[PDB]
């Protein structure tokens, strides 16, 4: 049979082919990105997994380690569900707690209402 395989942050169960496209279930704290193709992979009668289409990604606040999604260490953030690691808190910010999506700005600092969360804070 085809082995139970964890690949692309998604679990693919052990499966037997048929004389065989199977979908993958996203792993804990990983999700399918909004406009993206869901994890699918093909099983072959010789016991081989073939042509992986699509992937899951670690959601905000989590990053990819081995083949799991793990919380951002305190001091780091990840605001989108991207292929990136956790990013260190930017200039003029305060150390974030675990699983952070952004870092709080420092007393006396702000980021304009337009600016994203991956941006340094500026003097008010």
């Amino acid at each position, epitope marked *: 049979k085809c082995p139970e395989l964890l690949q692309g942050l998604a679990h693919f169960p052990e499966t037997i082919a048929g004389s065989a496209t199977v979908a993958g279930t996203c792993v804990d704290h990983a999700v399918v990105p909004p406009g993206g193709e869901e994890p699918r992979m093909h099983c072959a009668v010789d016991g081989e997994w073939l042509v992986p289409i699509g992937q899951c990604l670690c959601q905000a606040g989590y990053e990819k380690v081995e083949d799991a999604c793990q919380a951002c260490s305190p001091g780091f953030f990840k605001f989108e569900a991207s292929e990136s690691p956790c990013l260190e808190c930017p200039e003029h910010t*305060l150390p974030s707690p675990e699983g952070a999506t952004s870092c709080e700005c*420092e007393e006396g600092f702000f980021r304009a209402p337009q600016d994203p969360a991956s941006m340094p804070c500026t003097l008010v």
Partner: antibody
Amino acid sequence: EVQLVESGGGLVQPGGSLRLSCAASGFTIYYSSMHWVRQAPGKGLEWVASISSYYGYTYYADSVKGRFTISADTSKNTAYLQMNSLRAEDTAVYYCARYYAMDYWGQGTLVTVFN
Amino acid sequence: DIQMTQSPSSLSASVGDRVTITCRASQSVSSAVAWYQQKPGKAPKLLIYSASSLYSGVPSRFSGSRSGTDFTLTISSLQPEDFATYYCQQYYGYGGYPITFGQGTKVEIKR
């Protein structure tokens, strides 16, 4: 395994110049801040310079500002510290470390300024 | 330049004891404080980050605490491998202010 291997330290005369390298394996220099921390013989750690390819900033301690230049080449995952107008107090072991809370350090390289 | 005053500069202790090194910052520095151990001839090792969080792999006997500006590192039962020198470092603002270190505490064996 994240690794930092430094090189370039050694003997140099005042006013001469020297360049230290920091080759990194196991992670991407672009996605990380890198810092240089020096230790004079018998003293504690002193910060020297910092670099973030991502946010694009190069920061120096007040005591070395304008004589050293920090740089990095994300292709070769290597950060450089160029030391110019070298003085007696610049004699120290120079370390490169990753992140502000520095979780991985290089082994160090010894810079000796001799008259 | 936020000064980091480390106390004490030296202490002698027996194996198993509770060691407590203190570091008072000149300003509010949030939790942007870290602790390192250096054995002679070797590079420092991160011990505690965000003033209270254990790095991965550091033995559980190490801990860090905050109250306002006074950060304290504590060793619950000193083991023989913990005879070394310790540094507090603050990194407040993640680069917006100079990274400054404590001056160090050397922990020696009582005899």
